[PDB]
From Swiss-Prot, chain B:
Record-given protein name: Voltage-dependent calcium channel subunit alpha-2/delta-1
Domain of life: Eukaryota
Note: Binds gabapentin, an antiepileptic drug.
Subcellular location: Membrane; Cell membrane
Subunit relationships: Dimer formed of alpha-2-1 and delta-1 chains; disulfide-linked. Voltage-dependent calcium channels are multisubunit complexes, consisting of alpha-1 (CACNA1), alpha-2 (CACNA2D), beta (CACNB) and delta (CACNA2D) subunits in a 1:1:1:1 ratio.
Record note on modification: Proteolytically processed into subunits alpha-2-1 and delta-1 that are disulfide-linked.
Function: The alpha-2/delta subunit of voltage-dependent calcium channels regulates calcium current density and activation/inactivation kinetics of the calcium channel. Plays an important role in excitation-contraction coupling.
Curated annotation (Swiss-Prot), chain D:
Taxonomic placement: Eukaryota, Metazoa, Chordata, Craniata, Vertebrata
Function: Pore-forming, alpha-1S subunit of the voltage-gated calcium channel that gives rise to L-type calcium currents in skeletal muscle. Calcium channels containing the alpha-1S subunit play an important role in excitation-contraction coupling in skeletal muscle via their interaction with RYR1, which triggers Ca(2+) release from the sarcplasmic reticulum and ultimately results in muscle contraction. Long-lasting (L-type) calcium channels belong to the 'high-voltage activated' (HVA) group.
Species this protein is from: Oryctolagus cuniculus (Rabbit)
PTMs per UniProt: Phosphorylated. Phosphorylation by PKA activates the calcium channel. Both the minor and major forms are phosphorylated in vitro by PKA.
The gene coding this protein: CACNA1S
Swiss-Prot/TrEMBL domain comment: Each of the four internal repeats contains five hydrophobic transmembrane segments (S1, S2, S3, S5, S6) and one positively charged transmembrane segment (S4). S4 segments probably represent the voltage-sensor and are characterized by a series of positively charged amino acids at every third position.
Protein name: Voltage-dependent L-type calcium channel subunit alpha-1S
Amino acid sequence: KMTEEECRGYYYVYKDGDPTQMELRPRQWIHNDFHFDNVLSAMMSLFT
Amino acid sequence: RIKPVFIDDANFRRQVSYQHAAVHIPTDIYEGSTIVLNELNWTSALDDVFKKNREEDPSLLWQVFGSATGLARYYPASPWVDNSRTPNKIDLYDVR
Amino acid sequence: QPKPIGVGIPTINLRKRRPNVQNPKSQEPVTLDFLDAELENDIKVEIR
Amino acid sequence: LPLFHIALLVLFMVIIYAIIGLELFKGKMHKTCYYIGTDIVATVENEK
């Protein structure tokens, strides 16, 4: 899901990549913890 | 949402509501899209034909419309056998 | 009978199954041939 | 070539600490908690 509007609802995750062993997970539009949105966040990212 | 009354019937060994139709949407299909909400809108007119079919021949079992978008609108209304995450057991049912 | 049609011999692994993974069950129809429901002569084949 | 007496010290320190760790930890990190009755390691989201 490539858009904040599509990333709603639930989806399945497969443990160890086994298609017969899945769990439900609510999908959420997440932001990276170190990003480049302003010069302060960009400077923090470049510091790391 | 609608909170039905769910009398218990024969010919379905489960509690059933003859007042409206129930809708199933696959677990990983968001209910709230503009493709899904545009289907729950025009499929809302099947309910009075479901009722008419059922009252002309009361011997009639499930009547279902299975959509090319994943929806399944069936009559009479009855709770699905498997809620996805309300209990632990998830359901994998696609009408397609 | 209301049971599904079986194919082969079932084989389960107990060392590779998580407790709470919700395995899929089945989706197939109960297609039982007429010659597999009764005993099979050569007159029953021609009646069929 | 001036870095030769430093390499002969790093080699010997690595050899000393390897033998200390071989004496203290040999065959200790071989248990883990699997699922009861299974051969799947039981971990958490980001835990290794």
